[PDB]
């Protein structure tokens, strides 16, 4: 299951 | 190690030709089990392996929300990186991300990974310590400062040591018969005359899983790496793999050559010769 | 910007046996960027029904795709895979050889 650590570069 | 889970994200811009495409694929070892493509008719997360189909609507809906949020995030990230590199607005660029966990034979975490690339080159990667970053250049140091301020690495360590291992262990059980059974290669040596004075000896490995394998040729016990043509390991299309190694040998000297095979499904390595 | 040429392999799913139904595969790997044009050919002309795997990449960031179709090997028919990519000045054609 994928992670929810979603941040712009 | 014996097992791992990986997610692979690709985001591609296409100026003058619509919005950037985002694709995500998920693998357990060499088996793909999920896909999401922002260019699909109605973008949603799709099953790609029998053992994942049992997951309820909550699973697919959570995955779809994560991948839709990622689609928008990578569109913004592509714009950010174009600016960091002082690049023209005319060209297409790609950000790739690869992350996941590696479990040893005991089912315990060996290593966590989270790597990114920009236009095919290493950009930023989480170090083995699961707390610090390696940024390959001045532009990636901008992303590093944002990610250190946001405490991204602590969140990734929690994922990699926790939910990543939890879900990998769950998939490995739900697909025990297809994921934990190493199919040993079917092997054979073929012979093909090149002229009246030489012949190609080709050592084949077919229908094996996982993809990892070593095929080598020896002449009187000496390695023939320089003289061997070794093709890349390739998918058969039915979740098994194939590979061959070939050497050109003087006709009448074939007995001096041996092919050596090493694979997970073979308890002891093999030594094969051409059997006319 | 890194650009890498595609490696191409044309082969069958199962060992070739004239008159028996099999799958013809064209595996393209080691390329960058991701846009690539792959055609499976039967006697120099494009095959109508062709499927492909989902875009993925290796540890070195290079992409790979598998293109595949159902086929029946015969003595008279020749198969090939034609590939174009920004790294190639012209399309590259690799013929199917049952011994490879």
Residue numbers in the entry:
A (entry chain C): 1 to 9
B (entry chain A): 1 to 276
C (entry chain B): 0 to 99
The authors write:
We used the NY9 peptide (330NPDIVIYQY338) derived from HIV‐I reverse transcriptase as it is recognized by CD8+ T cells in HIV‐I–infected patients expressing HLA‐B35‐PY or HLA‐B35‐Px alleles. The data confirmed that the NY9 is a strong T‐cell epitope in HLA‐B*35:01+ HIV+–derived samples and an HIV epitope restricted to this HLA. HLA‐B*35:01‐NY9 (PY) exhibited the highest thermal stability with a Tm (thermal melting temperature) of ~56°C, while the HLA‐B*35:03 (Px) exhibited a Tm of ~38°C, which is very low compared with other HLA‐B35 complexes. The HLA‐B*35:01‐NY9 structure revealed a canonical orientation of the peptide in an extended conformation, with the main anchor residues P2‐Pro and P9‐Tyr binding to the B and F pocket, respectively. The central part of the NY9 peptide adopted a flat conformation in the cleft, and there was no secondary anchor residue that was seen before for HLA‐B*35:01. While the NY9 peptide adopted the same conformation when presented by HLA‐B*35:01 and HLA‐B*35:05 (root‐mean‐square deviation of 0.14 Å), it was different in HLA‐B*35:03 (root‐mean‐square deviation of 0.35 Å). Even though HLA‐B*35:01 and ‐B*35:03 only differ by one residue at the peptide‐binding site, this finding highlights the critical role of this residue at position 116 in the two groups (Px and PY) which seems to determine the preference for the PΩ of the peptide.
